[PDB]
Amino acid sequence: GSQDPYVKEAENLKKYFNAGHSDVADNGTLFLGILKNWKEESDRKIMQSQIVSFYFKLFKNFKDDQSIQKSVETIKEDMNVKFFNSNKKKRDDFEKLTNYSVTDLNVQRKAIHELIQVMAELSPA
Amino acid sequence: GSQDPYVKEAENLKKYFNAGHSDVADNGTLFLGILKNWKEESDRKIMQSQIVSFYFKLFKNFKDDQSIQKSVETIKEDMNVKFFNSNKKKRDDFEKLTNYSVTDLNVQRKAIHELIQVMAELSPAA
Amino acid sequence: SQLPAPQHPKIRLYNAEQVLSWEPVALSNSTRPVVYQVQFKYTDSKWFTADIMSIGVNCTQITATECDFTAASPSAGFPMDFNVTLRLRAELGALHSAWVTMPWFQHYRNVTVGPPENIEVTPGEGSLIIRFSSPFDIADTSTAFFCYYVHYWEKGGIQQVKGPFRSNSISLDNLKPSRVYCLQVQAQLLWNKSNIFRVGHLSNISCYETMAD
Amino acid sequence: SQLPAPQHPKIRLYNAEQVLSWEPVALSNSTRPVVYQVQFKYTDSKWFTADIMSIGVNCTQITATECDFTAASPSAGFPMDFNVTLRLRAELGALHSAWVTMPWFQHYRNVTVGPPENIEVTPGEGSLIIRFSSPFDIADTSTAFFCYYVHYWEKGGIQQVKGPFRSNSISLDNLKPSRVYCLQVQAQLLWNKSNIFRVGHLSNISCYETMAD
Amino acid sequence: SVPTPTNVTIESYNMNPIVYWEYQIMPQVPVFTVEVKNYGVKNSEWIDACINISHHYCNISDHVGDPSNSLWVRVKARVGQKESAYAKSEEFAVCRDGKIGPPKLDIRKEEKQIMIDIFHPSVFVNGETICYIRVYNVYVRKNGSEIKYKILTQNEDDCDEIRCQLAIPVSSLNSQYCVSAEGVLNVWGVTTEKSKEVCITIFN
Amino acid sequence: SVPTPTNVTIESYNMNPIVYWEYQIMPQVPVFTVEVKNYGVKNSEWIDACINISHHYCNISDHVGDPSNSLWVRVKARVGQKESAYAKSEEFAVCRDGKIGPPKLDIRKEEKQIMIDIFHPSVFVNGETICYIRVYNVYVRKNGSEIKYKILTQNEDDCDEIRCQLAIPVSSLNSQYCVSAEGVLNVWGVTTEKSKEVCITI
Ligand SMILES: *[C@@H]1O[C@H](CO)[C@@H](O[C@@H]2O[C@H](CO)[C@@H](O[C@@H]3O[C@H](CO[C@H]4O[C@H](CO[C@H]5O[C@H](CO)[C@@H](O)[C@H](O)[C@@H]5O)[C@@H](O)[C@H](O)[C@@H]4O)[C@@H](O)[C@H](O[C@H]4O[C@H](CO)[C@@H](O)[C@H](O)[C@@H]4O)[C@@H]3O)[C@H](O)[C@H]2NC(C)=O)[C@H](O)[C@H]1NC(C)=O
Ligand SMILES: *[C@@H]1O[C@H](CO)[C@@H](O[C@@H]2O[C@H](CO)[C@@H](O[C@@H]3O[C@H](CO)[C@@H](O)[C@H](O)[C@@H]3O)[C@H](O)[C@H]2NC(C)=O)[C@H](O)[C@H]1NC(C)=O
Ligand SMILES: *[C@@H]1O[C@H](CO)[C@@H](O[C@@H]2O[C@H](CO)[C@@H](O[C@@H]3O[C@H](CO)[C@@H](O)[C@H](O)[C@@H]3O)[C@H](O)[C@H]2NC(C)=O)[C@H](O)[C@H]1NC(C)=O
Ligand SMILES: *[C@@H]1O[C@H](CO)[C@@H](O[C@@H]2O[C@H](CO)[C@@H](O[C@@H]3O[C@H](CO)[C@@H](O)[C@H](O)[C@@H]3O)[C@H](O)[C@H]2NC(C)=O)[C@H](O)[C@H]1NC(C)=O
Ligand SMILES: *[C@@H]1O[C@H](CO)[C@@H](O[C@@H]2O[C@H](CO)[C@@H](O)[C@H](O)[C@H]2NC(C)=O)[C@H](O)[C@H]1NC(C)=O
Ligand SMILES: *[C@@H]1O[C@H](CO)[C@@H](O[C@@H]2O[C@H](CO)[C@@H](O)[C@H](O)[C@H]2NC(C)=O)[C@H](O)[C@H]1NC(C)=O
Ligand SMILES: *[C@@H]1O[C@H](CO)[C@@H](O[C@@H]2O[C@H](CO)[C@@H](O)[C@H](O)[C@H]2NC(C)=O)[C@H](O)[C@H]1NC(C)=O
Ligand SMILES: *[C@@H]1O[C@H](CO)[C@@H](O)[C@H](O)[C@H]1NC(C)=O
Ligand SMILES: *[C@@H]1O[C@H](CO)[C@@H](O)[C@H](O)[C@H]1NC(C)=O
Ligand SMILES: *[C@@H]1O[C@H](CO)[C@@H](O)[C@H](O)[C@H]1NC(C)=O
Ligand SMILES: *[C@@H]1O[C@H](CO)[C@@H](O)[C@H](O)[C@H]1NC(C)=O
Ligand SMILES: *[C@@H]1O[C@H](CO)[C@@H](O)[C@H](O)[C@H]1NC(C)=O
């Protein structure tokens, strides 16, 4: 009935990926176990950022599977709503940080340069 | 005189990578420009997590250059102090999330399974 | 080849309705009816054809000059949180027109909210009880909700606005007893992400007399 | 081959000092002095040899049975925020002993804080003014600072504790004038990350008389 | 070879799920073993729930960890000393596939209003999961007309651990207020059973 | 070919940096052009600061973006219609390499204490960078001995937009309180100039 739009599409991907078989329970958990350890939003957003970046990476590999394209991009918008608060700038800035190549020689030189001022505001005000 | 230990070591890596040449100013900024758009700590920690994960990956590639190992590992600990609040669990959980292979068939099926309960708590608590 | 694009398209965002309409395209040498194709897209996504599989209504290769996303069933249509972009083109077999792309909309941001439905007023001792239904049913009340305002006044008197209040029932206490008062109910949709509001339309004026004591 | 490992190592974390010591290693068949190698490591890092480039003091192949990281200059040594792990071994040329691994330590977490230095007391009207130096100089006050306590009591009276206070100067107001009061100054290091506190050592007893009027 | 069981189903009410299955009649009395495997446990392995039991059910309330975590159930048959292949079930989420009881409604009159108490179903009150109620659909019928109300659990001023309240103004005229309420689950929107309609009248 | 300039240096006081260089004396009078390239601007290219100038200096107060952002300066020489190769300078961070003026100290007596006002240096005058003061090292010498104080800018109860205050108790007996104060920058710990020591007597 009334449920967030991701629920319908997420369990559709479960069938496409056979995520409903009993063998998935093995080898502990990826995200669910860690997310319960951190209740403070500052701590949560640190972990969720890496998890959201993981799913965006995963969806990018399956951008050619037209069977699930509706479910994929529907989940992406709900992530854009729930995690980025529908802020397009927040979404685009996030996308920029991920696409940075750690092997681009030009990128690492700039990263080492900005390192000082990054550490300067790592701690809270 | 008295300055946080990263300053001394960061400018040492600056010289090893030739990050002091005038050519680095080209092609905008990676992190500094974005970080000025987000003043709320929730928004900051979202971006800083991607930035901190970037540096840890970069340092992992240069673990063989023994010339800079001192400068590299000092900055890593200061990140563990400033960003992870010296919480070893916070540091260790972060490393697990990064090391997950997005091409490992076993990993993506578990990720698709856990997707529902992750989305359930993406929004802030009431 | 190339066809003339559909004229003056409009997206109707009233209450929970979501209807895209446009003016028909005609030709001089027309042998069979021209069809149209509607497509939708999210904030940074690929264009999807509006078919029963994608969105639950079939709006591709259709003869009609409108497409109703919310007609099929309850909860159907685009989620009111989403950043949705629609586009449209007319085609006659191999020939098709250019894409007429609508502006992006978020339903909560662009809806024109109607007045509260089924307004019932019962008089009380120097007061009036107002019960009404919400302009439309919202799935997640935490993300968006209604704030109601009542514009009441004694016959021949000056306006007074009581509100806002969250409940669908309100008591207009402290009134002159055995006197006629006229009222209007107007809603206000509040979306916490936007922190900007949609001012709802007022209901019809209706006058009632309070009780004796 | 194999040599005996150094016996009973100790880490002295008093104020800003950082000294690693151990008991010397001797052999029955000893031809030349045994050398020692000290190494340090962070939370998740590689082992480094303690040489003039790494830490600013030369603690590799040293004849001494101790190594002082903080002797060279102010702020030299390991940063008081860092998680540092030390290990030690004795070697005589090609022969070397097993690694004696110390427990991990964070300077702010294991330090034994000393009493305030240079305590000066001047009497006032029904009060006593206390000025003192900090137990040690902290580079970043925002990450760590000191909270001071003064244990005062009339001679032959019951203990009273005024504090804590941020300033290095405090006024012991509301005292019986022209009466003898004894005081002790004790600092307490507060680290916001740990949310656990370091109880400092108390200073020597010193009694003083208030003014008459 | 021994035949494998068939028609494995799981039915949960108030987070007390029962496993059911069908088996053909045989000359001997077969015994069955029921094994549960939860998602979210390190190095997860099948936990035995019912061992060598002769009937066609197994109450597995004790193997329910998080009501929102998926779990699988398989059952095998033993006749004599020979066993059959396992009969595995579909994934089962207590929050999604199960059903929750109705809330208990209490009504009482005041001078200018009516205070409706909505007590949570007995599941959540006893002496940190995803699965709970986020909104209450409280239907209030005054004479012929019904209007839907919504009470959010997150509202600390309207709900607490024991109850949720709703205040409706009323008048002196004769009126018949009948109230029924239902709960909506947080993630899957599963609606609890509708409460027993409690009414009240305005005689004055 | 025309000779290149030498000894390019940048000296900054109160975030007003000046570029200096040395050039050999020649029969003609050479003119120079100074070009600046800042870090942190999109599509960054060398910006002209001083154009065809005959003397050996160029004030770049207008080309200072973030006082903590590195910037580079290069200069070429023109004699007649022939130009020289550029003389590029080392990277320059105003917060790191520059120097800041002293804070203004005010002293006044109260009934049981002395109120010391530490006015922020004249740089921060209204008329969001990393570069500011995090702690104030306030040295208070009472008779023979001085003790260092630390006032954090983040303390809303001790600092405001205009000043930072410190209260020190005193007694009626003869005492000489002399106070000087300096600021420490956030990132590089660069110390500002020490304030003119102001004293007071009881
Ligand atoms: C409901 O959905 C609607 C769509 O159906 C959403 O509507 C859009 O929202 C955005 C964001 O708020 C608006 O963008 C801004 O609008 C400003 C106003 O536009 C001016 O120009 C219009 C006409 O312009 C055209 O004609 C002129 C003259 O021929 C040409 O010179 C010009 O190039 C165009 O070809 C006028 O009709 C209008 O009245 C204004 O005068 C824009 O000015 C603005 O640009 C600003 O920002 C730029 C950088 O971001 C900057 O470079 C510019 O200089 C300028 O400062 C931007 O376009 C849309 O206008 C708006 N659409 C409509 C139709 O209003 C809407 O957001 C959503 N609901 C709600 C509640 O917002
Ligand atoms: C969505 O709706 C449109 C129309 O509302 C569907 O297109 C139409 O489908 C009908 C039935 O398939 C077609 O009629 C058939 O025509 C063939 C000859 O082409 C004839 O043999 C049949 O007996 C029948 O009359 C109709 O032509 C067609 N319209 C167009 C313009 O092609 C469409 O199929 C629907 N889409 C889905 C996914 O259901
Ligand atoms: C760190 O300090 C130790 C000792 O404190 C240094 O090791 C010692 O270095 C001295 C001088 O290099 C050695 O003495 C020399 O011995 C050679 C013969 O081996 C002789 O020809 C010289 O005239 C001089 O006497 C001493 O042997 C050596 N000790 C050991 C045990 O090897 C060490 O070099 C210092 N490290 C650094 C990086 O400075
Ligand atoms: C390099 O150029 C800049 C910009 O011209 C100079 O900065 C100027 O410095 C003065 C002195 O600190 C600032 O104060 C001014 O004071 C006068 C009266 O004393 C007043 O009339 C002005 O309105 C102003 O408040 C001034 O704001 C500042 N800017 C300008 C445009 O003058 C800088 O001094 C130069 N460097 C050197 C070494 O001269
Ligand atoms: C909603 O999504 C639309 C579709 O991407 C966005 O519209 C584009 O926004 C970019 C950046 O602002 C512009 O360069 C494009 O010109 C826009 N396209 C159109 C057709 O207008 C829109 O900005 C998004 N809005 C929000 C609030 O997320
Ligand atoms: C400080 O760093 C040391 C070095 O890694 C940590 O020591 C290990 O920590 C993990 C996780 O707590 C344990 O599983 C290991 O057994 C520890 N090793 C030893 C030798 O004790 C230490 O935990 C770190 N402390 C903090 C608070 O981060
Ligand atoms: C299945 O078994 C569980 C466990 O015994 C039952 O839950 C019990 O319910 C009774 C009735 O309220 C309580 O007295 C027990 O304390 C409960 N036990 C536990 C462990 O919670 C459940 O009712 C059973 N289901 C059926 C259908 O019989
Ligand atoms: C910057 O990007 C431009 C555009 O591709 C490229 O030509 C140039 O070499 C790049 N320089 C650096 C230092 O990355
Ligand atoms: C889990 O670990 C086992 C043991 O290494 C391995 O065989 C299996 O492929 C892993 N993946 C899953 C999804 O269980
Ligand atoms: C001396 O002999 C003992 C064994 O008896 C051995 O442990 C020790 O290392 C030897 N030392 C040398 C210098 O040969
Ligand atoms: C320092 O204290 C920590 C925390 O209690 C403890 O784990 C550790 O063993 C201590 N280190 C030493 C050298 O005593
Ligand atoms: C430049 O400065 C250096 C010292 O920094 C000095 O030795 C030299 O003479 C100066 N002139 C030239 C042309 O290098």
Name every residue whose Cβ is closer than 8 Å to that of residue E27 and which is 6 or more positions away in sequence.
none
* Contact across the interface for E171 and C170, Cβ inside 8 Å: no
Name every residue whose Cβ is closer than 8 Å to that of residue A105 and which is 6 or more positions away in sequence.
none
Task: Tell me the C-alpha distance between D186 and D170, whole Å.
Answer: 13
Query: Which residue is closest in CA terms to ligand 5's atom 17?
Result: C104
Smallest CA–CA distance from E88 into chain A, residue: A22
Name every residue whose Cβ is closer than 8 Å to that of residue B107 and which is 6 or more positions away in sequence.
A30, B100, B101
β-pairing, F198-201 vs F176-185, is: antiparallel
Ligand 9 and A22: CB distance under 6 A: no
Q: Which of F181, F185, F176, F148 is nearest to F165 (CA)?
A: F181
* Contact across the interface for B113 and E39, Cβ inside 8 Å: yes
Name every residue whose Cβ is closer than 8 Å to that of residue D207 and which is 6 or more positions away in sequence.
D155, D180, D181, D182, D183
Tokens of F12: 């900054």
| B88 inside 8 A of chain D by CB | yes
Domain termination residue (choose one: F50, F75, F98): F98
* Three-state DSSP class for residue D138: coil
A55 contacts B113 by C-beta, under 8 angstroms: no
Tokens of E30: 């077969």
Query: Which residue is closest in CA terms to ligand 12's atom 10?
Result: F7
Structural domains in chain B plus CATH codes: 1-126 (1.20.1250.10)
Q: Mark whether B and E touch (3+ CB pairs within 8 Å).
A: yes
Q: Specify burial of residue C137 (Cβ count, 10 A radius: 0-12, 13-18, 19+).
A: middle
* Contact across the interface for F171 and D129, Cβ inside 8 Å: yes
Task: Tell me the C-alpha distance between B54 and C11, whole Å.
Answer: 44
Which residues face E178 on adjacent strands? E141, E199
Give the mutation candidate from F10, F70, F88 for the B interface (greatest B CB count, under 10 A). Answer: F70
Query: Which residue is closest in CA terms to ligand 8's atom 7?
Result: B27
Name every residue whose Cβ is closer than 8 Å to that of residue E104 and which is 6 or more positions away in sequence.
E119, E121, E195
Ligand 9 and A26: CB distance under 6 A: yes
Q: What's the residue count for chain C?
A: 213
Ligand 10 and D27: CB distance under 6 A: yes
Same domain, E106 and E161: yes
CB neighbours (10 Å) of residue C174?
7
* Contact across the interface for A88 and C48, Cβ inside 8 Å: no
Same domain, E76 and E141: no
How far is C-alpha A50 from the chain's CA centre?
A: 6
* Three-state DSSP class for residue E20: strand
Under an 8 Å CB criterion, which residues of F touch D?
112-113, 134-135, 142, 145, 147, 149-150, 152, 154, 166-173, 189
* Ligand 2 centroid from CA C24, angstroms: 19
Residues F131, F136, F137, F138, CA torsion sign? positive
Domain termination residue (choose one: F69, F98, F127): F98
Ligand 11 and D109: CB distance under 6 A: yes
* Three-state DSSP class for residue A96: helix
Q: How was this structure determined?
A: X-ray
Domain termination residue (choose one: F38, F69, F98): F98
Name every residue whose Cβ is closer than 8 Å to that of residue D186 and which is 6 or more positions away in sequence.
D115, D116, D148, D149, D150, D151, D199, D200, D201, D202, D203
Same domain, E111 and E83: no
Same domain, F13 and F35: yes
Query: Which residue is closest in CA terms to ligand 10's atom 9?
Result: D3
Provide φ and ψ at A117, rounded to 5°.
-70, -20
- Upper half-sphere CA count for residue E121 (Cβ side, 13 Å): 23
Atom of ligand 5 nearest to the CA of A86: 28
Query: Which residue is closest in CA terms to ligand 5's atom 6?
Result: C43
Same domain, E85 and E2: yes
Same domain, F93 and F118: no
Smallest CA–CA distance from E185 into chain C, residue: C140
β-pairing, F71-79 vs F82-83, is: antiparallel
Atom of ligand 9 nearest to the CA of B105: 13
* Ligand 4 centroid from CA F31, angstroms: 25
Same domain, F88 and F111: no
C87 contacts C50 by C-beta, under 8 angstroms: no
Same domain, E88 and E109: no
| D27 inside 8 A of chain B by CB | no
E32 contacts E111 by C-beta, under 8 angstroms: no
Smallest CA–CA distance from F154 into chain A, residue: A125
Structural domains in chain D plus CATH codes: 6-113 (2.60.40.10), 117-213 (2.60.40.10)
* Ligand 3 centroid from CA D65, angstroms: 16
Same domain, F91 and F179: no
CB neighbours (10 Å) of residue F135?
25
Same domain, F1 and F86: yes
Same domain, E5 and E48: yes
Strands (E), D42-116: 48-49, 60-62, 66-68, 83-92, 95-96, 100-101, 105-106
Same domain, F193 and F111: yes
Provide φ and ψ at A66, rounded to 5°.
-65, -15
Here the CATH number for the domain that contains residue F180 is 2.60.40.10
Task: Tell me the C-alpha distance between E154 and B126, whole Å.
Answer: 6
Which residue segment(s) compose the domain that F149 sits in? 99-202
Name every residue whose Cβ is closer than 8 Å to that of residue E23 and which is 6 or more positions away in sequence.
E3, E5, E6, E30, E32, E56, E77
- Count how many domains chain F has: 2
Name every residue whose Cβ is closer than 8 Å to that of residue B51 and which is 6 or more positions away in sequence.
A97, A118, B31, B35
